[PDB]
């Protein structure tokens, strides 16, 4: 019947800049996940990517509550026996702040092919400066 | 050890991707103009390197 | 009567039940005999009394 469906021809992506400084990792990430998916758009269509591009600046200034800086471990496994490796959140934020944000958001996106495509619209930067001036990105202020 | 499942037509055809012949390493014979294998005596006329062999 | 318009008395003839002719009939597979035991076997069942 009549429910409109977005498609490649119809879709128009904005670029947005989110400042991570002073934001809680998960609270910021949940909002950004929703923007990359396109959940803020009335033309949201579940089988295409209706989301916007997001730049995150000041990734190393992201905050964590509690004792998470010391106590949140990022595990990975190399698929070699005994190959569990770990970094603390402090080690992550100091030396891999872009990965830290990318992991949080990646875990909040849908998991298959379109989800993987949705992640490609994210761009995370350690500093205050991003290289995407030519895309003319607007500041997006995170809601509650 | 025996096949646990039969192989589908598709998997059989994928495996045979590389089961092919190549075109011969062939070149025109300068003597008689028939194709010959490069670096071999031309069978048609018996020439190699502008000399008759089968004399 | 006419041999081309024969009609039995209503209720005089029924169709026989044919068991073991598919699931739709309600007597497919086990042909109404249930599962296993002496009563389901060919020639089966104990003698009268």
């Amino acid at each position: 019947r009549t429910t409109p469906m977005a498609n490649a021809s119809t879709i128009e992506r904005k670029w947005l800049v989110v400042d991570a400084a002073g934001k809680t990792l998960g609270r910021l990430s949940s909002e950004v996940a929703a923007i990359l998916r396109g959940k803020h758009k009335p033309t949201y269509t579940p089988h295409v990517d209706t989301g916007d591009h997001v730049i995150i600046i000041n990734a190393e200034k992201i905050e964590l509550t509690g004792k998470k800086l010391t106590d949140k471990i990022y595990y990975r496994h190399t698929q070699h026996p005994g190959g569990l490796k770990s970094r603390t959140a402090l080690e992550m934020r100091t030396n891999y702040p872009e990965k830290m944000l990318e992991l949080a958001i990646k875990g909040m996106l849908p998991k298959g092919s379109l989800g993987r495509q949705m992640f490609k619209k994210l761009n995370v930067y350690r500093g205050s400066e991003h290289p995407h001036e030519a895309q003319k990105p607007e500041v997006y202020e995170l809601r509650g | 050890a025996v096949p646990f499942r039969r192989t589908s037509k598709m998997k059989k055809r994928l495996r045979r991707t590389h089961f092919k012949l190549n075109v011969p390493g062939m070149t025109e014979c300068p003597s008689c103009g028939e194709m010959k294998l490069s670096h071999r005596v031309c069978k048609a006329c018996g020439s190699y390197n502008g000399k008759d062999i089968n004399v | 009567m006419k041999l081309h318009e024969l009609k039995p008395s209503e209720g005089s003839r029924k169709t026989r039940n044919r068991v073991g002719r598919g699931i739709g009939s309600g007597n497919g597979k086990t042909a109404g005999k249930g599962h296993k035991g002496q009563n389901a076997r060919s020639g089966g069942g104990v003698r009268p009394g």
């Binding site: 009549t2 | - | 699931i23 739709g24 497919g28 597979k29």
Partner: protein, 102 residues
């Protein structure tokens, strides 16, 4: 101009001159039919019903009484010898919208 009308147990956005398929009405091809439950009128002048727009109607001509393309409803329960096949062709009334009277 467009209207949201309640027909069937459903609602449909209609413009004038639009062919629409709806649940079967008690009508015949050729007959003008009237939708009395207009929930909303759009376009230039916007009437919002509460729930209905008072005095609004949409007239339509019945083009066709039909049945939709067949659905074979097949269902089974594995290992229990339970199969059930059933055809279905849902009746519809095809109507062309004549006039939206806001």
């Amino acid at each position: 101009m467009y209207a949201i009308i309640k027909t069937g147990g459903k609602q449909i956005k209609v413009e004038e001159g639009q062919t629409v398929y709806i649940e079967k009405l008690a009508a015949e091809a050729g007959e003008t039919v009237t939708f009395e439950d207009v929930l909303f009128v759009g376009g230039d002048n916007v009437k919002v019903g509460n729930p209905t727009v008072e005095g609004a109607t949409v007239t339509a001509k019945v083009e066709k009484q039909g049945r939709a393309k067949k659905i074979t409803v097949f269902r089974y329960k594995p290992k229990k010898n339970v199969h059930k096949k059933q055809g279905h062709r849902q009746p519809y009334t095809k109507v062309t919208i004549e006039k939206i009277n806001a």
